Structure formats: C-alpha cells, structure tokens
Design a protein around this ligand. Structure first.
Ligand code: CA
Length: 153
C-alpha cells in the first residue's frame, strides 16, 4: 500500500514524534504528544515515535512491521539504540512496540507488554485513538522515569 511504503520511505519525523498515517489523531493531541515526547528526549535522550496505519498491505503483523520500521529508519545500533517505535493498526485494533536495547531496557518488558495488550487494543476498540496513543505515551514515559505505573484502561 502507499501507506506501508510511505511510512517506511519517509523516514522518522525529526520535528514531530508521530506519523498519523491513519489520520486518527487530532492536532491538539499531536501537539500534546510532541510536548511530552520532545521533553522525554530532552531529559532522557530517548526518542519515542508513534505510528498509526489503517491496514498493512503485506501480511506482516504489527510487531513485524514495527521491527521493519526500526531497521529502515535507524539502520545501525548507533542510530537505533535510543529509539522506540510504537505501531497502531487501526482496522485491526492491534499494536506493537519495538526499539533499540537502551530504549527497551529503559521501559521494561512488563510495561511494554502491558501497553500493547491493554492501552492500545482496548482504547482503539472503543474508537478512542487519541487516548490510546496518549495514554500509552504517558505509560511508557512513567516506566522510563521510574514513576508509578498509571495502569491500563
Ligand atoms: Ca493508513
């Protein structure tokens, strides 16, 4: 699909932290994401990007595609070490999260697995894409900052 290709092709958003290809997020929430994530990057030197896509032309799943984006956008560990990539496939109500070792290590498997099995699928099923993405961003940030886990929906 032009979507699957564009997302890969266009590379990472170095000004915004979001590629809303499915167009399911409001400009206000995208502004709030940029603020939250630009602050995370300033403080912890971790660059977390969110990607929304309606459907994947290929048969690959969310995690497979997330990994494909990580490797294409950041083709070396020097570039990808502190990078995190969250994918949300809106039609499937499925999410995935991948990243470099430093990013993965900072979040922890507990929160990584919880965000993808709770916040993302649950909120998107209820058509709350803005909350799905922003609550996930908040939950991952809390894990990174060693703060109390806000929990899922
Ligand atoms: Ca799309």
């Amino acid at each position: 699909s032009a979507s699957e290709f564009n997302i890969l092709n266009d590379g990472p958003p170095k000004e915004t932290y979001v590629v809303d290809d499915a167009g399911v997020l409001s400009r206000v929430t995208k502004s709030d994401l940029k603020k939250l994530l630009s602050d995370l990057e300033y403080r912890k030197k971790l660059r977390l990007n969110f990607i929304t896509v309606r459907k994947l032309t290929s048969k690959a799943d969310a995690f497979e595609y997330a990994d494909q984006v990580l490797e294409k956008w950041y083709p070396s560990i020097e570039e990808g070490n502190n990078k995190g990539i969250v994918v949300l496939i809106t039609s499937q109500k499925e999410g995935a999260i991948t990243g470099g070792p430093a990013f993965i290590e900072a979040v922890g498997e507990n929160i990584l697995d919880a965000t993808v099995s709770e916040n993302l699928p649950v909120l998107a099923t209820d058509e709350k894409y803005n909350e799905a993405v922003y609550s996930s961003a908040k939950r991952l940030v809390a894990a990174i900052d060693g703060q109390p886990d806000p929990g899922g929906p």
